[PDB]
Design an enzyme around this catalytic site. Sequence first.
Site, mmCIF file in Angstrom:
data_model
loop_
_atom_site.group_PDB
_atom_site.id
_atom_site.type_symbol
_atom_site.label_atom_id
_atom_site.label_comp_id
_atom_site.label_asym_id
_atom_site.label_seq_id
_atom_site.Cartn_x
_atom_site.Cartn_y
_atom_site.Cartn_z
ATOM 1 N N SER A 42 1.214 -0.942 -0.191
ATOM 2 C CA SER A 42 -0.013 0.006 0.070
ATOM 3 C C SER A 42 0.933 1.333 -0.249
ATOM 4 O O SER A 42 0.103 2.450 -0.021
ATOM 5 C CB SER A 42 -1.354 0.253 0.984
ATOM 6 O OG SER A 42 -0.695 -0.294 2.086
ATOM 7 N N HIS A 155 14.347 -13.175 4.900
ATOM 8 C CA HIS A 155 13.864 -14.312 5.262
ATOM 9 C C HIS A 155 14.255 -14.964 5.777
ATOM 10 O O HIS A 155 14.094 -16.286 6.079
ATOM 11 C CB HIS A 155 13.094 -14.264 3.518
ATOM 12 C CG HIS A 155 12.155 -13.752 3.034
ATOM 13 N ND1 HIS A 155 11.536 -13.648 1.300
ATOM 14 C CD2 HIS A 155 11.216 -12.988 3.597
ATOM 15 C CE1 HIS A 155 11.392 -12.498 1.304
ATOM 16 N NE2 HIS A 155 10.984 -12.190 2.007
ATOM 17 N N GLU A 164 16.764 -14.155 -2.402
ATOM 18 C CA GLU A 164 16.120 -15.688 -2.462
ATOM 19 C C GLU A 164 17.097 -16.728 -3.727
ATOM 20 O O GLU A 164 18.175 -15.777 -4.321
ATOM 21 C CB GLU A 164 15.065 -15.887 -3.965
ATOM 22 C CG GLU A 164 13.767 -14.739 -2.824
ATOM 23 C CD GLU A 164 12.914 -14.353 -3.864
ATOM 24 O OE1 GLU A 164 13.084 -14.957 -5.005
ATOM 25 O OE2 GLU A 164 12.130 -13.895 -3.798
ATOM 26 N N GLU A 205 6.381 -19.250 0.357
ATOM 27 C CA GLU A 205 7.134 -19.344 -0.977
ATOM 28 C C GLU A 205 7.210 -20.498 -1.307
ATOM 29 O O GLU A 205 6.878 -21.486 -2.021
ATOM 30 C CB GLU A 205 8.498 -18.362 -1.197
ATOM 31 C CG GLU A 205 8.635 -17.117 -1.406
ATOM 32 C CD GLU A 205 7.804 -16.339 -1.931
ATOM 33 O OE1 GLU A 205 6.839 -17.644 -3.245
ATOM 34 O OE2 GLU A 205 7.057 -15.764 -1.875
ATOM 35 N N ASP A 242 17.820 -13.548 -6.604
ATOM 36 C CA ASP A 242 17.227 -12.953 -6.347
ATOM 37 C C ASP A 242 18.012 -12.210 -5.009
ATOM 38 O O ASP A 242 17.963 -12.205 -4.038
ATOM 39 C CB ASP A 242 15.525 -12.976 -5.789
ATOM 40 C CG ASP A 242 15.157 -11.688 -5.676
ATOM 41 O OD1 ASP A 242 15.526 -11.099 -5.758
ATOM 42 O OD2 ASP A 242 13.866 -12.098 -5.549
ATOM 43 N N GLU A 291 18.644 -11.545 -10.249
ATOM 44 C CA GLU A 291 17.592 -10.552 -9.969
ATOM 45 C C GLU A 291 17.785 -9.312 -9.032
ATOM 46 O O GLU A 291 18.140 -9.884 -7.780
ATOM 47 C CB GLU A 291 16.141 -11.103 -9.716
ATOM 48 C CG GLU A 291 14.761 -10.466 -9.656
ATOM 49 C CD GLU A 291 13.978 -11.052 -9.027
ATOM 50 O OE1 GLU A 291 13.804 -12.190 -9.879
ATOM 51 O OE2 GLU A 291 13.080 -10.526 -7.759
ATOM 52 N N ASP A 318 13.742 -5.872 -10.815
ATOM 53 C CA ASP A 318 12.187 -6.031 -9.671
ATOM 54 C C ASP A 318 11.627 -5.015 -9.009
ATOM 55 O O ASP A 318 10.428 -4.197 -9.551
ATOM 56 C CB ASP A 318 12.448 -7.136 -8.796
ATOM 57 C CG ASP A 318 11.633 -7.321 -7.828
ATOM 58 O OD1 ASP A 318 10.106 -6.885 -8.174
ATOM 59 O OD2 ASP A 318 11.073 -7.740 -6.868
ATOM 60 N N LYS A 343 4.859 -8.229 -12.447
ATOM 61 C CA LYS A 343 3.661 -8.142 -11.046
ATOM 62 C C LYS A 343 2.508 -7.812 -11.231
ATOM 63 O O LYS A 343 2.613 -6.236 -11.890
ATOM 64 C CB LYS A 343 4.534 -8.320 -9.748
ATOM 65 C CG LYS A 343 5.731 -9.163 -9.284
ATOM 66 C CD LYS A 343 6.065 -8.413 -8.728
ATOM 67 C CE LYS A 343 7.172 -8.664 -7.187
ATOM 68 N NZ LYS A 343 7.540 -8.427 -5.877
ATOM 69 N N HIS A 371 5.074 -13.593 -8.554
ATOM 70 C CA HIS A 371 4.037 -14.295 -7.970
ATOM 71 C C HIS A 371 4.060 -12.420 -6.794
ATOM 72 O O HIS A 371 4.698 -12.053 -6.714
ATOM 73 C CB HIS A 371 4.449 -15.670 -6.822
ATOM 74 C CG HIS A 371 5.221 -15.282 -7.062
ATOM 75 N ND1 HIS A 371 6.792 -16.521 -7.179
ATOM 76 C CD2 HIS A 371 5.810 -14.549 -5.405
ATOM 77 C CE1 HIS A 371 7.231 -15.783 -6.340
ATOM 78 N NE2 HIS A 371 7.392 -15.437 -5.553
ATOM 79 N N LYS A 394 8.133 -16.882 -12.440
ATOM 80 C CA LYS A 394 8.334 -17.437 -11.688
ATOM 81 C C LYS A 394 7.716 -16.698 -10.007
ATOM 82 O O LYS A 394 6.766 -15.630 -10.421
ATOM 83 C CB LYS A 394 9.392 -15.938 -10.863
ATOM 84 C CG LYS A 394 10.252 -15.557 -9.943
ATOM 85 C CD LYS A 394 10.953 -14.138 -9.479
ATOM 86 C CE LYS A 394 11.498 -14.697 -7.593
ATOM 87 N NZ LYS A 394 11.802 -12.919 -7.203
#
Lengths: 434, 352, 105
Positions: A42, A155, A164, A205, A242, A291, A318, A343, A371, A394
């Site tokens: 947002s 993560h 990633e 994921e 990533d 990425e 990205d 995306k 995604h 992806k």
Amino acid sequence: MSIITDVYAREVLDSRGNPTLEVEVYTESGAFGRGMVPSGASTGEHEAVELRDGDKARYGGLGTQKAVDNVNNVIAEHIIGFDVRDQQGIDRAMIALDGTPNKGKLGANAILGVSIAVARAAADYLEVPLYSYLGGFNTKVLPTPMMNIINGGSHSDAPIAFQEFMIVPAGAPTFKEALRWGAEIFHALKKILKERGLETAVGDEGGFAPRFNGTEDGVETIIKAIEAAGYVPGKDVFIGLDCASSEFYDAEHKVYGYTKFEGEGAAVRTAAEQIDYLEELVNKYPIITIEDGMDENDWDGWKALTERLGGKVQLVGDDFFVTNTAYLEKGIAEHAANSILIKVNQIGTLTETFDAIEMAKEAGYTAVVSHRSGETEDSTIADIAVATNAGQIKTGSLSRTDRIAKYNQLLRIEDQLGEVAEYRGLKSFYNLKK
Amino acid sequence: DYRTFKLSLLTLAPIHIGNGEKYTSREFIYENKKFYFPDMGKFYNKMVEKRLAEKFEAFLIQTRPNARNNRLISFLNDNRIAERSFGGYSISETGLESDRNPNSAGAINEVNKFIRDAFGNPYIPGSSLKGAIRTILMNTTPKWNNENAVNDFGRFPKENKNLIPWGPKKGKEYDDLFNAIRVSDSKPFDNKRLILVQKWDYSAKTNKAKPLPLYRESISPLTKIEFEITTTTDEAGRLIEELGKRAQAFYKDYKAFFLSEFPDDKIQANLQYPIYLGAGSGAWTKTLFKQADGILQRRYSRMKTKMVKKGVLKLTKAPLKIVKIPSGNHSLIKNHESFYEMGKANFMIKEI
Amino acid sequence: MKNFKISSTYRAARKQQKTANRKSFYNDEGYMISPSEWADGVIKGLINPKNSWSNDHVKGYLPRVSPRSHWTKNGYREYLGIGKSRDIPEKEPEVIEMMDLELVV
């Protein structure tokens, strides 16, 4: 009989347990379409923002009743009466009705739900597959999947700066075989981590986030799992990263701080040092995709990286491009990157998603349909990837249904296409020489 | 210390100002392509000399006429009266006075009367024009068209009458602005300028005009009526000298708010400074529509005639009229279904 | 109402927006009342059951109504009101001379 008769949104839950919305479109003949919106962000300077209630009593401020009311009381009155096949007219009408570049008034989630529901209802009315309706008759290419397998960075608590790690089974003859290879490598890695004492539970994921010693240890375990499953790294399965170096980039000193995730013993690398590090990683390992190798604002770095590595590795932007037509045009003009991460909820409508994919294709870039962290049972991005003949997707790991749904949709698309279906693999990396 | 302005009003559409009274069908005669409204006293005086006083009294007493004994022409035909000299006046038949046949069905049962003086001559009161001017001024002044204009301390919202100060205050200097603006009424015009229009409502959802049983006595389009406006202070002098370019601003806001949702051929064009006068022009022409939006519609949410969205457009029917202006030939309305925007008028204000 | 009929698009919209499942009821003065008191008034005779209820609201500005057709003498189809619409051009208009009029730009 193709006139849109009813538009109705309701609040549901996405794969993280957070709310999102979902739109149903009914036409006069009874054709029905259902679009569900992944959970995006947002906030953003030039990203399509989504509407959340902010009521801390309900769902911790992440309710979507405001966007639901926008669809039910504003968008529905304007869209009912349109032809269901007038996708571009409906999307332009919603954009004009909102009247904000970042789509903050109605909410990007509301507009995306209506757009997807309208496209699905139009495909239902014409009794054609969604990829056939979206991309025409010449839809045959099954995307090459970049399967997220190990995630670190923000993560994970492991000392890994990169966000990633992915396996790309580009050497498979069909998409079905590529999916089988990815699943078998996933299970082999699960066994390897179980015999190493590392944690097995998956993240948002479907991939593992174990406590590796470093990036090199993680990549070495990736190749170990690929070989344990019985496949040749660098010939059948490749490695993608990533980095998302925007998270550990310190803008004040204009340096990439690896100490944020890898501890105080890590190396603080400048732009040139980051280029050299990425180059030696590409030389050491069979890395085919990197990425977000640089920060979203480091344009000179991005250009230098494209000159250094853009002939042999795929550089995906990205957060560098944020699915923005203006930013993608600027990057094409400045020769920054050679790929863009698409995306769909980052831009707001299917028309703009398509427009960005075609703009990237015309410049020699590759469009990778991606995604979100919070996904749903909706698997439209698979039909988008096949419809555009994008050749890459992806769509996450091999564990959870928010990923397996899109993988199953691609299996169904391949089965439906039959002898016409094409899996190109390495040929999908047309942005790379030879 | 007094400034005098002359306001010339040119009606672009039928304008009705009522007195609360209505002609019933036992009071007018539709014949010879006109509506004749006799004087009831003169009619009764001529009917007592023809020995039909008791018959006429039984005709008027009857509270439940079936379908035809409700018209005066039926009494005049059954009892064989040929005289038509009963005083009163007449209105020329337009054709677009009722969507049905006025001499066949129930048709025009009641006519809303125009305001008249003791001599029976129609005129426009100064209070009506002052109310229209006050709406124009209040809607275009940001210190009066704000959320402080709504009195929320009550069961349901209402207007804050104390927002523009009025009346005497104890020990304070007199501060009534609208006592300084003094709008006089008109010299009476003739009954030859009166027509018998009917109410039609145009819905943005139904996309068509629906006629309603509401017939009014209205001034015909292209009628010239003069008003004198007196100002006793300086602020009110600036306000009245700015009556145009405030009427234009009010109409611009009204068009961007309400009139933009309707077909362009249903909306009239302005020759001079626009204004909306009298009954039938709508709710938004009589309110601060920026602040009354939401409240006004919810006032009617539990009635059968529910106000949906911003309401319907009021479009009466009256004969098409071309005007000769320096630009050439101007049509008052842009449609061929003969639809006037009811209550619309134009004005020019000079500094005599 | 014979020249036009209910449009099929509006009928479908009303059908699967379920607007007839959310009726509002009124008494003889046109005031919203609960279905229990509406039933009680209709049974007692104080409310006309025909013109005292509403079928909610259909969204989307759909045309409620479409032209109705009939058969001409040779068996062809034709709109009911297309051919009897008008016969005379109503004479008119009147060109009022108003050269003395200050227009506003």
